[PDB]
RNA sequence: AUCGAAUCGCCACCUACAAGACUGGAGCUUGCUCCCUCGAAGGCGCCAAGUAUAUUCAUGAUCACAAGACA
RNA sequence: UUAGGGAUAUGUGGCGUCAAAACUUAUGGGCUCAUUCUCGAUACGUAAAGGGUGUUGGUGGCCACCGGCCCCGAAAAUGGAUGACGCU
């Protein structure tokens, strides 16, 4: 209401600025859980199949053999985590399951992964997997 | 030579003192530091930022959580950092470690400045590494 | 217009172990295959190439079919088609691609700062010229609102 | 679906921003129907969110009469004792594409149902999609690389309007108005585009020299 | 108000349109030659608002969902 | 050809989606267009004579004959099947 003066000042200041993204970096690659190893007869759930962005070749997929892999999700209640006492800021409904890359699959860059002591749940099919850069050989 | 001797190591040649490394995990993930030495008995590496540039103090780190690039800085600092410096009894920094930090960092900064390409190396140490959409780290040289 | 397949025509290899190398057509076998050689390159001895794997360039050294290596070397040198090919932007793009493929973390950092410097100076120059001739959305709106503000307020 | 008042109340209480999920918009003009469907179904199973536009411009190999006869053979399938239960034959091009994709998914399973519900299809380009960003194509399913040029081919909207689709003229008029609007705006933005081009061309004198050398070495001159 | 949660690029320079037997512009020798935009990059973003001896980072103690957060 | 479980490699059969595998491989060669059951496409397993300048080659003398794919010849009873979608 007769306060066009505020909108008059904002235009005059307007210079060329950009968003510039200076935030906490991500140190992993994005993959997806395609499914389990299977044939026409049925599936074996002890091995999972993972497809990673920009990895489209068997030679590419060999680079990741041995790297660690994570599936992040959430539950309904807050339960125990690592550093539950030392760092109370970590406490949440967020949880993760860990595994390792074992070998490539096919010629197109898919890889086989094995999880620690148990199978990954089938509710993760079609969802995101983190593939880290460690342990490192470089 | 003897495996029981503390001098015995198996570290890969890329992680040699003076090499500039990228941190892959921990509180300082993504920062770049300088490898000072490896602790005895085939122990971890010790790295420092220096803390003026990127804020990374003297710290132990496993060589499996590091990428050792081919860029190097010539270091001839006193390097009097044993295992006891990082062992503690059963914003707050002790007056001994606080002094050791300065004694090392001044020498490290003098070495970087004395090096050619010193300004570029300082900026390189100040920058932060990240994985962008569309990136393919498996295809790169380091 | 298009560059015909003919004896003496320069080509670039598309895929395979000889990718992004330049040769000269010395003979046509049939609709699918040619014989290619480049004396001034190490891996381009006389060999067979499928016509789906080549890219015809704009230069043709004038030679007859199944010519000798001696007669093709000097014809190349006199034509100076290689010194001409090295000056185009597609040749420079190929060399840039190789240089980028073989690069260290330090060099990638150098390129990043060079591009940031260019962008900063470009946006500065743009702001200065937009001050004179208003072309940004905010400057167009400012000039549209100035006349209204001159009255009343 | 109109959002509920409880959702609006929660959004106000949280005080967040306007959220948009990650969506890929595919321009389907001059794409091969079966190959585009085969690629899209696999991406949907891998978990993407996809919207397709310009479904009336898909292509099928062969003549229009042959393809129309195939459709009429499909149309005559009908549960004799009660046709309100028999196969339902959709006539619009976007519904044709959706059925083709549905046949390449495990529809009876919930996973298949989620994948199918993650796809949206349109005829033409609607105004709620026009401004969302650059559209994409599928290189391995384009006509100019898939068909030999000498053979005849069909256009899906032309085939559909003879078996019963009744909105071809509406879509044509809408697309005409759309293209005129976009062209006028594009021409209006030319001064801005040229100013930015000139600014980049001229900053090479004001930057430091040793940066320009790196640009030249990596081919960004 | 429950609510802690999975997701980890942004743009008022992409977010207009057509062709692929053919496609910057000229010739006449219609497949060669000559001209110059050289015909194989949307723009930014990745730690000093910008390429320059400026500057707090620790004890969160060697991995753990990024203890951060929607540039 | 078979005790209860891991890893590696194979057989028959496969590698557009359903559905693991060439994210539709090759920097291999030929051939083929089929309009109301319909080109064709996993053996065992559920169409003939005769015609065709449709197209591709072969023998002997622009001709006569012999081939390869495709097209007529080819007509039943609820709506429906290369397994489905589709593929040129
Ligand atoms: Mg967390
Ligand atoms: Mg598969
Ligand atoms: Na089958």
TrEMBL record, chain A:
Gene Ontology biological process: cytoplasmic translation; ribosomal large subunit biogenesis
Domain of life: Eukaryota
Keywords linked to the UniProt accession: Ribonucleoprotein, Ribosomal protein
Family note: Belongs to the eukaryotic ribosomal protein eL33 family.
Keyword Repressor attributed: no
Species this chain originates from: Leishmania major
PANTHER family xrefs: 60S RIBOSOMAL PROTEIN L35A (PTHR10902)
GO cellular component, one term: cytosolic large ribosomal subunit
Region described as Disordered: 1-21
Keyword Repeat in annotation: no
GO molecular function: structural constituent of ribosome
Record protein name field: Putative ribosomal protein l35a
From TrEMBL, chain B:
The organism's place on the tree of life at top rank: Eukaryota
Any single Pfam family the record assigns to this protein: Ribosomal_L6e
Keyword Acyltransferase found: no
GO cellular component: cytoplasm; cytosolic large ribosomal subunit
UniProt entry keywords in alphabetical sequence: Metal-binding, Ribonucleoprotein, Ribosomal protein
GO molecular function, one term: RNA binding
Coiled coil: none
Biological process terms in GO annotation: cytoplasmic translation
InterPro entries for this protein: 60S_ribosomal_eL6, Rib_uL2_dom2, Ribosomal_eL6_KOW, Translation_prot_SH3-like_sf
Residues reported in the UniProt entry to bind Mg(2+): 60
Family that this chain belongs to: Belongs to the eukaryotic ribosomal protein eL6 family.
Record's protein name: Putative 60S ribosomal protein L6
UniProtKB/TrEMBL annotation, chain C:
UniProt xrefs under InterPro entries: KOW, Rib_uL2_dom2, Ribosomal_eL14, Ribosomal_eL14_dom, Ribosomal_eL14_KOW, Translation_prot_SH3-like_sf
GO molecular function, one term: RNA binding
GO cellular component, one term: cytosolic large ribosomal subunit
Listed Pfam families: KOW, Ribosomal_L14e
Keyword hit for Membrane: no
KOW domain boundaries: 8-37
Gene3D superfamilies: 2.30.30.30
GO BP terms in the entry: ribosomal large subunit biogenesis; translation
Statement: the UniProt record of this protein carries the keyword Ribonucleoprotein: yes
Ranges for domain Large ribosomal subunit protein eL14: 45-118
Keywords: Ribonucleoprotein, Ribosomal protein
Domain of life: Eukaryota
CDD domains according to UniProt: KOW_RPL14
Residue ranges crossing the lipid bilayer per the database entry: none
Matches recorded under PANTHER family: 60S RIBOSOMAL PROTEIN L14, LARGE RIBOSOMAL SUBUNIT PROTEIN EL14
Similarity remark: Belongs to the eukaryotic ribosomal protein eL14 family.
Entry protein name: Putative 40S ribosomal protein L14
From TrEMBL, chain D:
Keyword Calcium (UniProt): no
UniProt record, GO biological process: negative regulation of translation; translation
A GO CC annotation given for this chain: nucleolus
Keyword NAD: no
Assigned keywords, A-Z: Ribonucleoprotein, Ribosomal protein
Family to which the UniProt record says this protein belongs: Belongs to the universal ribosomal protein uL13 family.
Protein name: Putative 60S ribosomal protein L13a
């Amino acid at each position: 209401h007769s306060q066009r003066s505020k909108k008059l000042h904002q235009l005059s200041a307007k210079t060329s600025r950009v968003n510039r993204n200076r935030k906490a970096p991500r140190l992993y690659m994005k993959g997806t859980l395609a499914g389990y190893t299977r044939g026409l007869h049925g599936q074996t759930k002890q091995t999972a199949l993972v497809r990673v962005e920009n990895v489209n070749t068997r030679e590419d997929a060999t680079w990741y053999v041995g790297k660690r892999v994570c599936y992040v999700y959430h539950g309904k209640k807050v339960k125990r985590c690592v550093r539950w006492s030392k760092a109370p800021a970590r406490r949440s409904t967020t949880r993760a399951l860990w595994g390792r890359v074992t070998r490539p699959h096919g010629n197109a860059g898919m890889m086989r992964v094995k999880f620690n002591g148990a199978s990954v749940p089938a509710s993760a099919i079609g969802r995101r997997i983190r593939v880290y850069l460690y342990p490192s050989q470089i | 030579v003897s495996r029981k001797s503390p001098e015995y190591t198996t570290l890969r040649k890329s992680c040699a003192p003076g090499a500039i490394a990228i941190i892959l995990a921990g509180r300082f993930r993504g920062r770049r530091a300088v490898i000072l030495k490896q602790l005895p008995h085939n122990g971890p590496l010790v790295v420092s930022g220096p803390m003026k540039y990127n804020g990374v103090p003297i710290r132990r780190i496993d060589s499996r959580y590091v990428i050792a690039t081919s860029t190097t800085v010539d270091i001839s600092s006193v390097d009097t950092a044993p295992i006891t410096a990082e062992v503690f009894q059963r914003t707050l920094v002790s007056d001994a470690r606080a002094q050791l930090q300065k004694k090392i960092d001044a020498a490290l900064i003098a070495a970087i400045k004395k090096d050619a390409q010193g300004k570029e190396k300082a900026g390189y140490l100040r920058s932060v590494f990240t994985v962008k959409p569309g990136d393919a780290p498996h295809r790169w040289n380091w | 217009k298009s560059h015909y397949i003919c004896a003496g025509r320069l080509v670039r290899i598309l895929r395979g172990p000889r990718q992004d190398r330049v040769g000269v057509i010395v003979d046509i076998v049939d609709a699918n295959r040619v014989l290619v050689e480049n004396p001034e390159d190490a891996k381009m001895w006389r060999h067979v190439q499928n016509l789906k794997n080549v890219e015809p360039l704009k230069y043709c050294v004038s030679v007859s079919r199944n010519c000798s290596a001696k007669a093709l070397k000097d014809a190349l040198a006199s034509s100076k088609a290689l010194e001409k090919y090295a000056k185009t932007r597609t040749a420079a793009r190929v060399e840039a691609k190789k240089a980028c493929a073989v690069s260290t973390d330090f060099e990638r950092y150098q390129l990043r700062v060079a591009r940031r410097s260019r962008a900063h100076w470009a946006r500065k120059v743009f702001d200065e010229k937009d001050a004179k001739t208003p072309v940004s959305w905010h400057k167009v709106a400012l000039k549209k609102m100035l006349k209204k503000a001159a009255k009343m307020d | 679906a109109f959002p509920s008042r409880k959702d609006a109340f929660r959004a106000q209480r949280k005080g967040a921003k306007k959220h948009r999920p990650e969506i890929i918009v595919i321009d389907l003009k001059d794409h091969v129907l079966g190959r585009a469907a085969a690629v899209v179904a696999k991406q949907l199973l891998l978990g993407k969110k996809i919207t397709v536009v310009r479904c009336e411009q898909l292509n099928i190999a062969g003549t229009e009469i042959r393809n129309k006869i195939k459709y009429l053979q499909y149309l005559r399938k009908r549960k004799l004792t009660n046709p309100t239960k028999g196969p339902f034959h959709h006539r619009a091009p976007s519904d044709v594409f959706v059925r083709t994709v549905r046949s390449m998914l495990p529809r009876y399973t919930k996973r298949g149902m989620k994948a199918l519900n993650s796809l949206v299809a349109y005829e033409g380009i609607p105004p709620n999609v026009v401004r969302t960003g650059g559209r994409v194509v599928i290189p391995r399913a384009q006509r100019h690389v898939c068909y030999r040029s000498e053979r005849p081919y069909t256009v899906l909207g032309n085939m559909c309007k003879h078996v019963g689709w009744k909105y071809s003229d509406v879509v044509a008029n809408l697309e005409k108005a759309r293209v005129e609007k976009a062209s006028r705006h594009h021409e209006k933005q030319a001064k801005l585009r040229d100013a930015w081009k000139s600014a980049r061309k001229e900053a090479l004198a004001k930057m430091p020299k040793h940066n320009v050398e790196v640009l030249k070495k990596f081919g960004y001159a």
